[PDB]
Amino acid sequence: KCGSGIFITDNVHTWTEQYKFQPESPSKLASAIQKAHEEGICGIRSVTRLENLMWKQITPELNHILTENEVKLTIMTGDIKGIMQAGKRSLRPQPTELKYSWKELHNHTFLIDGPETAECPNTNRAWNSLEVEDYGFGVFTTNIWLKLKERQDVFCDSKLMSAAIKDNRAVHADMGYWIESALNDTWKIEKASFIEVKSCHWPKSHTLWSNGVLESEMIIPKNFAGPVSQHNYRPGYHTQTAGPWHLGRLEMDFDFCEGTTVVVTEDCGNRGPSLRTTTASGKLITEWCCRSCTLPPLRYRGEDGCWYGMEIRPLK
Amino acid sequence: KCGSGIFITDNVHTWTEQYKFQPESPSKLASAIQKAHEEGICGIRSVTRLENLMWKQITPELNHILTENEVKLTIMTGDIKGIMQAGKRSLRPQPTELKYSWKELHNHTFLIDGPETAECPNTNRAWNSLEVEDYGFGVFTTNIWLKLKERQDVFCDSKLMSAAIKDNRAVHADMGYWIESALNDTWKIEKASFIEVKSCHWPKSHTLWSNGVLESEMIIPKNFAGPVSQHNYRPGYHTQTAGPWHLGRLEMDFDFCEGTTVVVTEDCGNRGPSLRTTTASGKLITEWCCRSCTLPPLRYRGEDGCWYGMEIRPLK
Amino acid sequence: KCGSGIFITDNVHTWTEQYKFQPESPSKLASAIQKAHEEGICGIRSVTRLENLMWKQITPELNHILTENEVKLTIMTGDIKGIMQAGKRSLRPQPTELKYSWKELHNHTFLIDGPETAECPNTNRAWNSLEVEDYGFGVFTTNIWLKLKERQDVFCDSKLMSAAIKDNRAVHADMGYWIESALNDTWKIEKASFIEVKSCHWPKSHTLWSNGVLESEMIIPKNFAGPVSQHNYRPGYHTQTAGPWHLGRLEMDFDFCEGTTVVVTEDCGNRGPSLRTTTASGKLITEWCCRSCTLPPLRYRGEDGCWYGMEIRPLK
Amino acid sequence: KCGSGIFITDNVHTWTEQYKFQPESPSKLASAIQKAHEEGICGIRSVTRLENLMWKQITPELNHILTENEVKLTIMTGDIKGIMQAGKRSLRPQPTELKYSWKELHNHTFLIDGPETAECPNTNRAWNSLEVEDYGFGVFTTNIWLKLKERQDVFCDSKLMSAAIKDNRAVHADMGYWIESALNDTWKIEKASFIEVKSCHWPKSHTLWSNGVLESEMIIPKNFAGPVSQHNYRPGYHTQTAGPWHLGRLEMDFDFCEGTTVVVTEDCGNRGPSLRTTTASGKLITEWCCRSCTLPPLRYRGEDGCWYGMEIRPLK
């Protein structure tokens, strides 16, 4: 009989850990580092948080398994501090290697993601090189996956992504971002969950209404993977370039923060970098104004106090 | 604790019946027809199949409940024959009415959807007037719903619609259309299920990659609600303007029809209207050629035999 | 990484049509009838509604394709009228056949489902013989499926079934039955959807709390596939043996029917067969009493008016 | 229109963290401990892992906020080491309290879950006292929840549970347990995921086929929350009472561990406590026998090497 048919559900993959990358075995990757090191590369800064974990998970192996190939170097991991900036280089295969598939530290230093930007510039660090392909299938081990990007690219991973819309709401999904929008009378952004900030450009292939979108009228800037959509719009708002992105995990919501309220005026100044966490004396500013805002204003919530959108400045 | 969170599944609403529209009670609707009839309107042709059913489900009521308001007219329903064309008019509130909320046929004739295009032109028939709003909630009775469109519009319903994508496939969903696309190496259309053909324009708010889309490089023409997307692309193809849309229920697939095969050549002519159901003698044409096609070609499947895309013509 | 994992959703398969059974091709089935006819079998009465449709869908073929095997007989289908009773016989393979896989009506009559119980007794009709196995996979055509039951059995089909529970509610699912229960303070039945009534016994392998269940304390009797569960319990209630099961499609709900109310008393009589659709004069009985009931009482809703549970009788 | 309807999906809640219990505010709970302490109670050992985390998450508050009520004591948290045994007492409200809703350590010791069984016996520790009710709704903060159990009970929490079955497989779900069974020809257990081991009895309200189940023919013993079901059966097997439950996180699978194979014989001895992780010399035993087993045998997998079921013993 018939029958159309119809299926598919999405998504069930928020805040998971994750992630490893062996396989792909460090054989090809380590040989790439050796051939990259002689090319003058110095550091690696990850494009995703789990990528930084995968380096940290496998780094002691490359500390010695690379030395098993009579080549000497040292690699040390670091920590995560938002924003997770972008490197200006990448490494490519080069699939030829001379080593054994499963068969330190006096030499020069090859950096790994760490708060040491003053040591080596981002212009001398590879970025967004290794990524799925292949897949995440199928026993939660990925996968064998994490193939090398043949072509230099700025877009994020195209595999672990999602976007959907059903009659009241549209969401954009990846490992970290959970931008969500709703429809009261006009489609507009409602809430979003941020757990990191990646500088990779959001890919058009997983957006909605990607027509006539103004880069200056967004909510989340494109440079921090802001989806090109009308769902990134909101009346009386503009891009949050100077927002508190340096914080690690964030939250998007239209509301009033605790003990504070905002009055719509016109004497209030123009946009400016966010504030309110915290006052030097530990106090707060109960007064708040915004010129072209729209109540409820944008509050910033995370592993900290409160911040407000750049349209919101204190009266005094 | 936290918590993101994450939910939502879609979709579960293919080939359902459906559909009624009372409530909204025929009180306001019937009074609108009475005020529309004195405005020179003659016919109604539905924008969706279920709308035609709703007329057929409620038509005997307006045959007499309208006469209870000392106004006389006659309305007769018809049948469905693809394509379900579009009327060039609409009716609008006008919310003032003088009748009773629940408290023929000698006069002039007000037409209803039926195969009688030679009687009254489509330019004298209302179209795409009544639609949800409000909703479908919540006991499968809609809803109270089916409010009047204040503004004349060409886009289809924005409520009962859906679209999604998850790491391998993207689909566009409504009551009837089930356009689906996949990713082997480049994103392209794979299959689609057609059960009617509505002339309402597909709205951009539920599409994907709606940038740089060429109206001449689609698969499904925009005039028959072809989503503006790269997922409507396919290499070596163009728009199916002259396809066998007159058939009621269709099927999109890249394959070879039974007992036939296609050889890629260059002497084969250019595109032309589809064929192969059936030969005047009941035979078939085993030979097939296409100039700029790409195997497997486009076959048309439905409540009939086989048809091929316009790029596919017989050698002889 | 890890990873548990976790998936599965259920269900999306209510009120679907469905259903065909070719394949399995009528080759083996028809030969079985021919060998069954010489065994003295006379009638066929389906165990599911869709089975009756499958007979009706394929019956003209066996009217003549059986005659192609130089054996003559006649078969006529009928209609569906609740309840869909059970036959006391069945047909079994016997896989040997002498005919062609795809290569009337003067002789005796082999009855099929029809309101002709006075003609041939149910004790001379086969029942619950053909069923899935194999499956419903995978293009909505089943399947090839509908294999013969090697062993005589009374339980319903074990393939197309479902049951689940998640923190507030438990449901039992098949093609037609949608028994549902909830938890306010003690687990109890809340609502159920009936679209047919099959006499096959509900299988224990898809129930819940199948311990210490009293056959006299159910809501839906076992003989009409009442799941053996505590979720079939309700305080102050018993089995609905004499309910209005003769109606085709039903509805289970705890509420008051329109224009009527029930007062809890003790002078009211004991249980008795249901009523209230309709009064001989077309009226209703606004007064209602029940001895050991519990408000809200059980109302019967369907393609008819209202009926009440046997615990509910009029005061006069 | 109609409409049945049909919905519900399950589950999406594996390996989450979780969990906090404020609210309910420690006001009532702390006063309960103070009144419990004068009743001779000594320690607390949690029934779930997240409960132990909840104690660890809130313990410093009760270290001092209890002292704010001019009563002095000390509470020290510990660690988790399987199995998470059961205490023989509980604490009950007693809702009367004299303190302030949000307005150490010289005194006696009130113990908390930790590897100190030699200090205070489990017979002098409360267990399975606090649990949801109320709910987990609705911002991932629960909830306000964690109400006191009015009645002493041995069953686990009834709220955060799940069980389902759909045409090929049945699963039992809670925070940690993911017992799963399938159907090849007879229903039998296939795989299960264990991340803790709780001594609370599995509740019958969320099982399947809870009839005629023999406590000696299960796979997972009832004392460690083994669902009473036929899905806990397996031919040629019995209960895993003496299994390696002392390990924290486990895995159920029918397979052969790496580098080892099992031969079915009869000279092999009877059942015995599991082994094979590891040999005193770090070796393995490639030879394996089992009297009444059935290939593939039961392997134990987790944060360790391999173990085999009690039916499997070495030949030598």
Side-chain angles (χ1 to χ4, degrees), chain A residues 6 8 10-11 13 159 161-167 169 204-211 230, chain B residues 6 8 10-11 13 159 161-167 169 204-211 230:
Chain A
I6 171 170
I8 276 285
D10 195 76
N11 194 29
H13 227 298
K159 178 80 194 202
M161 301 215 58
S162 189
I165 174 176
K166 166 61 165 296
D167 78 77
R169 277 187 293 111
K204 317 198 137 315
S205 67
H206 292 54
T207 83
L208 269 73
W209 213 86
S210 72
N211 48 310
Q230 61 180 356
Chain B
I6 171 170
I8 277 285
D10 195 76
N11 194 29
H13 227 298
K159 178 80 193 202
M161 271 256 276
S162 190
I165 174 176
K166 166 61 165 296
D167 78 77
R169 277 187 293 111
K204 317 198 136 314
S205 67
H206 291 54
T207 83
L208 269 74
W209 213 86
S210 72
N211 48 311
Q230 60 181 357

Short mmCIF file of all heavy atoms in Angstrom, two decimals, chain A residues 6 8 10-11 13-14 159 161-167 169 204-211 230, chain B residues 6 8 10-11 13-14 159 161-167 169 204-211 230, unseen atoms left out:
data_model
loop_
_atom_site.label_atom_id
_atom_site.label_comp_id
_atom_site.label_asym_id
_atom_site.label_seq_id
_atom_site.Cartn_x
_atom_site.Cartn_y
_atom_site.Cartn_z
N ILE A 6 6.99 8.96 5.60
CA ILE A 6 7.38 10.12 6.40
C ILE A 6 8.04 9.67 7.70
O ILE A 6 7.53 8.77 8.39
CB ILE A 6 6.15 11.01 6.67
CG1 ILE A 6 6.48 12.10 7.69
CG2 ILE A 6 4.98 10.17 7.17
CD1 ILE A 6 5.39 13.15 7.80
N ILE A 8 11.82 10.87 10.46
CA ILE A 8 12.91 11.77 10.84
C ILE A 8 12.54 12.55 12.09
O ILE A 8 11.44 13.09 12.20
CB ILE A 8 13.33 12.71 9.69
CG1 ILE A 8 14.31 12.01 8.74
CG2 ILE A 8 13.92 14.01 10.23
CD1 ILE A 8 15.71 11.87 9.30
N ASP A 10 14.56 15.29 15.17
CA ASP A 10 15.74 16.11 15.40
C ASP A 10 15.46 17.24 16.38
O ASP A 10 14.48 17.97 16.21
CB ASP A 10 16.24 16.69 14.07
CG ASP A 10 17.63 17.25 14.18
OD1 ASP A 10 18.60 16.47 14.21
OD2 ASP A 10 17.76 18.49 14.24
N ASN A 11 16.32 17.44 17.39
CA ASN A 11 17.56 16.69 17.57
C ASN A 11 17.65 16.14 18.99
O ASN A 11 16.81 16.47 19.84
CB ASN A 11 18.77 17.60 17.28
CG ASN A 11 20.06 16.82 17.11
OD1 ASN A 11 20.05 15.66 16.68
ND2 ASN A 11 21.18 17.45 17.44
N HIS A 13 21.02 15.74 20.55
CA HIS A 13 22.47 15.71 20.67
C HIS A 13 23.02 17.02 21.24
O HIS A 13 23.94 17.63 20.69
CB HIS A 13 23.11 15.41 19.32
CG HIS A 13 24.17 14.36 19.38
ND1 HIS A 13 25.33 14.51 20.11
CD2 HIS A 13 24.25 13.14 18.80
CE1 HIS A 13 26.08 13.42 19.97
NE2 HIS A 13 25.44 12.58 19.18
N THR A 14 22.47 17.47 22.37
CA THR A 14 22.96 18.67 23.04
C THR A 14 23.88 18.32 24.20
O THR A 14 23.64 17.35 24.93
CB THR A 14 21.79 19.52 23.55
N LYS A 159 29.00 18.27 8.63
CA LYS A 159 28.38 17.00 9.00
C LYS A 159 27.49 17.15 10.23
O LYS A 159 26.28 16.97 10.16
CB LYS A 159 29.46 15.94 9.25
CG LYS A 159 28.91 14.61 9.69
CD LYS A 159 28.39 13.80 8.52
CE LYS A 159 27.56 12.63 8.99
NZ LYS A 159 27.48 11.56 7.96
N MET A 161 25.50 19.01 12.01
CA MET A 161 24.72 20.24 11.92
C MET A 161 23.25 19.89 11.83
O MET A 161 22.88 18.75 11.54
CB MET A 161 25.12 21.09 10.71
CG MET A 161 26.57 21.51 10.67
SD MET A 161 26.72 23.15 9.96
CE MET A 161 25.68 24.07 11.08
N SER A 162 22.40 20.88 12.09
CA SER A 162 20.97 20.68 11.98
C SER A 162 20.26 22.03 11.95
O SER A 162 20.77 23.03 12.46
CB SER A 162 20.43 19.84 13.13
OG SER A 162 19.08 19.48 12.88
N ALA A 163 19.07 22.02 11.34
CA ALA A 163 18.18 23.17 11.33
C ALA A 163 16.79 22.67 10.96
O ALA A 163 16.65 21.74 10.16
CB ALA A 163 18.64 24.24 10.34
N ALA A 164 15.76 23.30 11.53
CA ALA A 164 14.40 22.85 11.31
C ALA A 164 13.44 23.98 11.64
O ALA A 164 13.82 25.01 12.22
CB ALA A 164 14.08 21.60 12.13
N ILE A 165 12.18 23.79 11.26
CA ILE A 165 11.10 24.73 11.52
C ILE A 165 9.77 23.99 11.42
O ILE A 165 9.56 23.21 10.49
CB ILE A 165 11.14 25.92 10.54
CG1 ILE A 165 9.93 26.83 10.74
CG2 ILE A 165 11.23 25.44 9.10
CD1 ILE A 165 9.96 28.08 9.88
N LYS A 166 8.87 24.20 12.39
CA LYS A 166 7.56 23.54 12.33
C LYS A 166 6.52 24.46 12.97
O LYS A 166 6.34 24.47 14.19
CB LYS A 166 7.61 22.17 12.99
CG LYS A 166 6.25 21.55 13.27
CD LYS A 166 5.45 21.34 12.00
CE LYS A 166 4.28 20.40 12.23
NZ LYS A 166 4.72 19.03 12.61
N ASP A 167 5.90 25.29 12.13
CA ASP A 167 4.63 25.99 12.32
C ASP A 167 4.62 27.01 13.46
O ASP A 167 3.69 27.82 13.54
CB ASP A 167 3.49 24.98 12.54
CG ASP A 167 3.45 24.41 13.95
OD1 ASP A 167 2.99 25.11 14.88
OD2 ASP A 167 3.86 23.25 14.14
N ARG A 169 8.15 27.73 15.29
CA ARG A 169 9.50 27.98 15.77
C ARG A 169 10.49 27.40 14.78
O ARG A 169 10.21 26.41 14.11
CB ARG A 169 9.72 27.36 17.16
CG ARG A 169 9.25 28.21 18.32
CD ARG A 169 9.66 27.60 19.65
NE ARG A 169 8.98 26.33 19.89
CZ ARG A 169 9.57 25.15 19.90
NH1 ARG A 169 10.87 25.02 19.68
NH2 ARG A 169 8.84 24.06 20.14
N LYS A 204 25.85 28.45 4.70
CA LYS A 204 24.54 28.79 4.15
C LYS A 204 23.66 27.57 3.95
O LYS A 204 22.43 27.70 3.94
CB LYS A 204 24.70 29.54 2.83
CG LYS A 204 25.78 30.60 2.83
CD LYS A 204 25.58 31.57 1.68
CE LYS A 204 25.78 33.01 2.10
NZ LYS A 204 25.10 33.31 3.38
N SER A 205 24.25 26.39 3.78
CA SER A 205 23.50 25.19 3.45
C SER A 205 22.58 24.73 4.56
O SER A 205 21.75 23.84 4.32
CB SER A 205 24.46 24.05 3.08
OG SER A 205 25.21 23.66 4.21
N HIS A 206 22.69 25.29 5.77
CA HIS A 206 21.85 24.86 6.89
C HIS A 206 21.11 26.03 7.52
O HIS A 206 20.76 25.97 8.70
CB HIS A 206 22.68 24.13 7.94
CG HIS A 206 23.20 22.80 7.50
ND1 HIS A 206 23.94 22.63 6.34
CD2 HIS A 206 23.07 21.56 8.04
CE1 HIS A 206 24.25 21.35 6.20
NE2 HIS A 206 23.74 20.68 7.22
N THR A 207 20.86 27.10 6.76
CA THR A 207 20.13 28.26 7.24
C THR A 207 18.73 28.29 6.64
O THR A 207 18.31 27.39 5.90
CB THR A 207 20.87 29.55 6.92
OG1 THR A 207 20.58 29.95 5.57
CG2 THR A 207 22.37 29.35 7.06
N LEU A 208 18.01 29.36 6.95
CA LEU A 208 16.67 29.61 6.43
C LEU A 208 16.58 31.05 5.96
O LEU A 208 17.26 31.93 6.49
CB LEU A 208 15.60 29.36 7.50
CG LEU A 208 15.00 27.96 7.60
CD1 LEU A 208 15.99 26.99 8.21
CD2 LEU A 208 13.72 27.99 8.41
N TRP A 209 15.74 31.28 4.95
CA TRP A 209 15.45 32.63 4.45
C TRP A 209 16.74 33.41 4.17
O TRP A 209 16.90 34.56 4.57
CB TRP A 209 14.55 33.40 5.42
CG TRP A 209 13.61 34.36 4.74
CD1 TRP A 209 12.38 34.07 4.23
CD2 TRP A 209 13.80 35.77 4.54
NE1 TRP A 209 11.81 35.20 3.70
CE2 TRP A 209 12.66 36.26 3.88
CE3 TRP A 209 14.84 36.66 4.84
CZ2 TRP A 209 12.51 37.60 3.52
CZ3 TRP A 209 14.69 38.00 4.49
CH2 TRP A 209 13.54 38.45 3.83
N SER A 210 17.69 32.75 3.50
CA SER A 210 19.00 33.34 3.24
C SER A 210 18.95 34.26 2.02
O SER A 210 19.73 34.15 1.08
CB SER A 210 20.04 32.24 3.06
OG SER A 210 19.86 31.57 1.83
N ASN A 211 18.01 35.20 2.06
CA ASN A 211 17.83 36.18 0.99
C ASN A 211 17.71 37.57 1.61
O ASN A 211 17.02 37.75 2.61
CB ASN A 211 16.59 35.90 0.15
CG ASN A 211 15.36 35.64 1.01
OD1 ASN A 211 15.40 34.84 1.94
ND2 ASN A 211 14.28 36.35 0.72
N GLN A 230 16.54 35.65 8.26
CA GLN A 230 15.66 36.63 8.88
C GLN A 230 15.45 36.32 10.35
O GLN A 230 15.15 37.22 11.14
CB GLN A 230 14.31 36.69 8.16
CG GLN A 230 13.52 35.39 8.17
CD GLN A 230 12.19 35.50 7.44
OE1 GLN A 230 11.82 36.58 6.96
NE2 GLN A 230 11.48 34.39 7.33
N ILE B 6 16.68 20.67 24.78
CA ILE B 6 16.58 20.26 23.38
C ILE B 6 15.40 19.31 23.21
O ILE B 6 15.22 18.37 23.99
CB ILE B 6 17.89 19.62 22.91
CG1 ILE B 6 17.74 18.99 21.53
CG2 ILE B 6 18.36 18.57 23.91
CD1 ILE B 6 19.06 18.57 20.92
N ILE B 8 11.78 18.56 20.08
CA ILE B 8 11.11 18.79 18.80
C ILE B 8 11.33 17.61 17.86
O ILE B 8 12.45 17.12 17.72
CB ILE B 8 11.54 20.12 18.14
CG1 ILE B 8 10.74 21.29 18.71
CG2 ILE B 8 11.39 20.05 16.62
CD1 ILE B 8 9.31 21.36 18.21
N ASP B 10 9.74 16.04 13.87
CA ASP B 10 9.01 16.43 12.67
C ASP B 10 9.39 15.57 11.47
O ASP B 10 10.58 15.40 11.19
CB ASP B 10 9.27 17.90 12.36
CG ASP B 10 8.30 18.47 11.35
OD1 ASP B 10 7.15 18.74 11.73
OD2 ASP B 10 8.69 18.62 10.18
N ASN B 11 8.41 15.04 10.72
CA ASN B 11 6.99 15.31 10.93
C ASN B 11 6.21 13.99 11.00
O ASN B 11 6.77 12.93 10.74
CB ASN B 11 6.45 16.19 9.79
CG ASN B 11 5.09 16.78 10.11
OD1 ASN B 11 4.76 17.02 11.27
ND2 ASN B 11 4.29 17.03 9.08
N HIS B 13 2.67 13.94 9.81
CA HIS B 13 1.38 14.44 9.32
C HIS B 13 1.27 14.31 7.81
O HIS B 13 0.93 15.27 7.11
CB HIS B 13 1.17 15.88 9.76
CG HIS B 13 -0.19 16.14 10.34
ND1 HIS B 13 -1.35 15.98 9.61
CD2 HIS B 13 -0.57 16.54 11.57
CE1 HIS B 13 -2.39 16.27 10.38
NE2 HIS B 13 -1.94 16.62 11.57
N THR B 14 1.54 13.13 7.27
CA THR B 14 1.40 12.88 5.84
C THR B 14 0.09 12.17 5.53
O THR B 14 -0.34 11.29 6.27
CB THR B 14 2.57 12.04 5.31
N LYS B 159 1.04 28.28 8.25
CA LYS B 159 0.88 27.54 9.50
C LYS B 159 1.25 26.07 9.33
O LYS B 159 2.23 25.60 9.91
CB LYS B 159 -0.56 27.68 10.00
CG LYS B 159 -0.84 26.90 11.27
CD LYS B 159 -0.33 27.63 12.50
CE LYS B 159 -0.32 26.72 13.72
NZ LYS B 159 -0.35 27.50 14.99
N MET B 161 3.05 23.82 7.80
CA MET B 161 4.21 23.70 6.94
C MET B 161 5.40 23.23 7.76
O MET B 161 5.38 23.28 9.00
CB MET B 161 4.52 25.03 6.24
CG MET B 161 3.81 25.21 4.92
SD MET B 161 4.95 24.94 3.56
CE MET B 161 5.73 26.55 3.44
N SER B 162 6.43 22.75 7.07
CA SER B 162 7.62 22.28 7.77
C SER B 162 8.79 22.17 6.80
O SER B 162 8.61 22.04 5.59
CB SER B 162 7.38 20.94 8.45
OG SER B 162 8.46 20.61 9.30
N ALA B 163 10.00 22.22 7.37
CA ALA B 163 11.24 21.98 6.64
C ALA B 163 12.33 21.67 7.65
O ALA B 163 12.32 22.21 8.76
CB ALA B 163 11.63 23.19 5.78
N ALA B 164 13.28 20.82 7.26
CA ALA B 164 14.33 20.40 8.19
C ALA B 164 15.50 19.84 7.40
O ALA B 164 15.42 19.61 6.19
CB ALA B 164 13.81 19.37 9.19
N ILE B 165 16.61 19.63 8.11
CA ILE B 165 17.83 19.06 7.56
C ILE B 165 18.67 18.50 8.70
O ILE B 165 18.83 19.15 9.74
CB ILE B 165 18.62 20.11 6.75
CG1 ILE B 165 19.96 19.55 6.28
CG2 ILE B 165 18.82 21.38 7.56
CD1 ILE B 165 20.75 20.49 5.39
N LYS B 166 19.20 17.29 8.53
CA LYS B 166 20.06 16.72 9.57
C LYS B 166 21.11 15.82 8.91
O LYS B 166 20.87 14.64 8.63
CB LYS B 166 19.23 15.97 10.60
CG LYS B 166 20.02 15.06 11.54
CD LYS B 166 21.03 15.85 12.36
CE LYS B 166 21.55 15.02 13.53
NZ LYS B 166 20.47 14.69 14.50
N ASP B 167 22.26 16.42 8.60
CA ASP B 167 23.57 15.81 8.34
C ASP B 167 23.62 14.91 7.12
O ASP B 167 24.72 14.55 6.67
CB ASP B 167 24.05 15.02 9.57
CG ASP B 167 23.38 13.66 9.71
OD1 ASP B 167 23.76 12.72 8.97
OD2 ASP B 167 22.49 13.51 10.57
N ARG B 169 20.32 14.81 4.78
CA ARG B 169 19.12 14.98 3.97
C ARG B 169 18.38 16.22 4.43
O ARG B 169 18.42 16.58 5.61
CB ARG B 169 18.21 13.75 4.07
CG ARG B 169 18.58 12.61 3.13
CD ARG B 169 17.53 11.51 3.17
NE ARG B 169 17.50 10.84 4.47
CZ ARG B 169 16.50 10.93 5.34
NH1 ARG B 169 15.42 11.66 5.08
NH2 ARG B 169 16.59 10.28 6.49
N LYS B 204 9.24 31.93 1.15
CA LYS B 204 10.66 31.82 1.45
C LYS B 204 10.94 31.47 2.90
O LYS B 204 12.02 30.96 3.21
CB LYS B 204 11.36 33.12 1.08
CG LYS B 204 10.92 33.71 -0.24
CD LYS B 204 11.92 34.72 -0.75
CE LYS B 204 12.19 34.56 -2.23
NZ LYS B 204 12.41 33.13 -2.58
N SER B 205 9.99 31.73 3.81
CA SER B 205 10.23 31.58 5.24
C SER B 205 10.45 30.13 5.67
O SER B 205 10.88 29.91 6.80
CB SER B 205 9.07 32.16 6.04
OG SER B 205 7.89 31.41 5.83
N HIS B 206 10.18 29.15 4.80
CA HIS B 206 10.36 27.75 5.17
C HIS B 206 11.27 27.02 4.19
O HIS B 206 11.15 25.80 4.03
CB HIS B 206 9.01 27.03 5.27
CG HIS B 206 8.16 27.49 6.42
ND1 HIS B 206 7.84 28.81 6.64
CD2 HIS B 206 7.57 26.79 7.42
CE1 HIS B 206 7.09 28.91 7.72
NE2 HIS B 206 6.91 27.69 8.22
N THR B 207 12.17 27.73 3.52
CA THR B 207 13.11 27.14 2.58
C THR B 207 14.51 27.11 3.17
O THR B 207 14.75 27.49 4.32
CB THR B 207 13.10 27.91 1.26
OG1 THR B 207 13.97 29.04 1.37
CG2 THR B 207 11.70 28.38 0.93
N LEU B 208 15.46 26.65 2.35
CA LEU B 208 16.87 26.58 2.72
C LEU B 208 17.71 27.14 1.59
O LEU B 208 17.34 27.04 0.42
CB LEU B 208 17.30 25.13 3.01
CG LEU B 208 17.19 24.62 4.44
CD1 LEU B 208 15.74 24.37 4.81
CD2 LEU B 208 18.02 23.36 4.62
N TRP B 209 18.85 27.74 1.95
CA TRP B 209 19.82 28.24 0.97
C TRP B 209 19.14 29.12 -0.08
O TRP B 209 19.36 28.97 -1.29
CB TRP B 209 20.58 27.09 0.32
CG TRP B 209 22.01 27.43 -0.05
CD1 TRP B 209 23.09 27.35 0.77
CD2 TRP B 209 22.50 27.87 -1.32
NE1 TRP B 209 24.23 27.73 0.09
CE2 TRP B 209 23.89 28.05 -1.19
CE3 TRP B 209 21.90 28.14 -2.56
CZ2 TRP B 209 24.69 28.48 -2.25
CZ3 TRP B 209 22.70 28.56 -3.61
CH2 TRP B 209 24.08 28.73 -3.45
N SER B 210 18.29 30.04 0.38
CA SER B 210 17.53 30.90 -0.51
C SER B 210 18.37 32.09 -0.98
O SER B 210 17.98 33.25 -0.87
CB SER B 210 16.25 31.36 0.17
OG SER B 210 16.53 32.31 1.18
N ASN B 211 19.54 31.78 -1.53
CA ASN B 211 20.45 32.79 -2.04
C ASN B 211 20.94 32.38 -3.42
O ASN B 211 21.27 31.21 -3.64
CB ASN B 211 21.66 32.99 -1.12
CG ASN B 211 22.31 31.68 -0.73
OD1 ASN B 211 21.64 30.75 -0.29
ND2 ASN B 211 23.62 31.59 -0.90
N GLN B 230 18.89 25.65 -3.22
CA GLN B 230 19.85 24.84 -3.96
C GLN B 230 19.40 23.39 -4.01
O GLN B 230 19.76 22.66 -4.95
CB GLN B 230 21.24 24.93 -3.33
CG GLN B 230 21.32 24.45 -1.89
CD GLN B 230 22.72 24.58 -1.32
OE1 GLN B 230 23.66 24.97 -2.01
NE2 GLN B 230 22.87 24.24 -0.04
#
